Amino acid sequence: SMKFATGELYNRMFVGLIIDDEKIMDLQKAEKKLFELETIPGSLIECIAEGDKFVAHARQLAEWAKKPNDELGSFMYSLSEVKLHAPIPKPSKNIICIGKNYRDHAIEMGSEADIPEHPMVFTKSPVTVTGHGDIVKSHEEVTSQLDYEGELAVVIGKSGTRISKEDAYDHVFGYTIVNDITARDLQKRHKQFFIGKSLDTTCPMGPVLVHKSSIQEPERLKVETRVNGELRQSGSASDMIFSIPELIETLSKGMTLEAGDIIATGTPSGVGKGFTPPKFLRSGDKIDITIDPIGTLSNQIGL
Amino acid sequence: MKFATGELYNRMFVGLIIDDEKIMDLQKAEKKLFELETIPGSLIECIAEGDKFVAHARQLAEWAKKPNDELGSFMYSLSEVKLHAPIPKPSKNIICIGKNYRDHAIEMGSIPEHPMVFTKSPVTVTGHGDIVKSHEEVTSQLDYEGELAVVIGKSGTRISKEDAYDHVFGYTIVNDITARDLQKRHKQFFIGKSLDTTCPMGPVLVHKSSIQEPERLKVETRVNGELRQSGSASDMIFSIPELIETLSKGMTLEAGDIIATGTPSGVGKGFTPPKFLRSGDKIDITIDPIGTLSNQIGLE
């Protein structure tokens, strides 16, 4: 499984590959030591633009790193020592978000007639983006209706416009997790969702970006969200109203999708707003979103 | 102080308009005057440097008036240069205000007490004189919207109304070209607002020091010569300072962020028979003293 990450260790930010879910390889330093080359770019978004050849190079480096050698510790780090950022800490454009792409989410937010015949697409500013283990601001002076949304995110590899459904997966690099944290009152107040979706720190992403070659069946992916331990959301990607291929086809009809664009494909039912008494987030709340085999994205709402 | 992104000999460069006929290549001017190289290669990077950059640009322009042998190595006639959008590649989506003029809101079917805010993808951004794709296989309801755009010069969150202009770098023009059917179809405006090439911007970015009175600015839009729109920035429902205060309440505005402040009445959708854009149509948007932003709708 090819799982890429942006890590930080002793104030160096680096593009990393997860090895056996316990170690992470610093790909640039590994390339230098094992291949005596320096070609790997310093950000994952630049690596994504290189496509399959970067991924095959990374796979080769991981294979070589298993051969006996005496300087493993210069480039192979235990995950416990490494802070994971969002795989793409600074997207080049807003995160593209789909609204109401699971039937029961649409229903819990209103009724059956709120189910779209066409995708509802909005965005989150890049200033939302944060990583596994980061504190999300509670934004208490702005809203008392912060809510969680666990989602599967797709990262585009090959750039393209007018992409057909049939070719869509050819333009996909990989998959990560997003928490599309939303201020529900701000959504209603401003009508368009941008402001209520774009508060600082409200898009945890990660913990890793799994290359599509490790996930040939994305329709079988499952999203689970727990809030303070309690199961809130449990969706299957196959229940999406619009599939990933349809979303890519729609989005690209008149617009170029570019390497490293991130599409959040919508949350299942189970959001805070959906309960009678609504259950909004508060300081100290812990949110864990699991999609195997991406792993678990965990954040706490700040004090 | 009118800044631009020009292109000459296949190189894009940050420029300063001199006497509305010439453009100074700031990096090459600095090198020739000071034999130093500190000016960054994009306008957004220059904006992030703050007041330092503007004072340096002022100094270079003053020096460039002195006789000097090789003026032509850094001072070009505007007619020889292609102008891009001042910020050809924003670092995030353009922030757009909907319904910020009374009569625009009315002509579209009816006034907000809170701003309606959406975005345009960076892939929309294009420059003065560039062709806007007609997108005929996607929509037959392309429409025009002349607007004043504000560029943030200094990053901030929880910016007060009173301090708002302190976070402003300058002003440019945008054409917020919109597919009206796609707006209705997808409900949120993003898709209808984010077709490739549908955000002409420019032709220049005027530093705020040349416009201390933005409420007196006027937008005029002509389509094939004909006056369609005519707004005054003073009729905006929410002012520039209020928009900055609202936007930044829970969100960091960063150096180089662009806010399109809304279009007056006169849009194609506002006429009975609606007047949508077609291949060959020419749109000219004028805001003095920024100048005129001109684009043509492309071939099918």
Ligand SMILES: O=C(O)C(=O)C[C@@H](O)C(=O)O
């Ligand atoms: O469905 C999602 O994942 C959304 O972001 C939309 C949600 O905010 C809503 O209004 O129901």
Ligand SMILES: O=C(O)C(=O)C[C@@H](O)C(=O)O
């Ligand atoms: O007022 C503007 O500038 C807008 O972009 C909004 C407009 O597209 C609308 O349908 O309300």
Ligand SMILES: [Mn+2]
């Ligand atoms: Mn969502």
Ligand SMILES: [Mn+2]
């Ligand atoms: Mn507009």
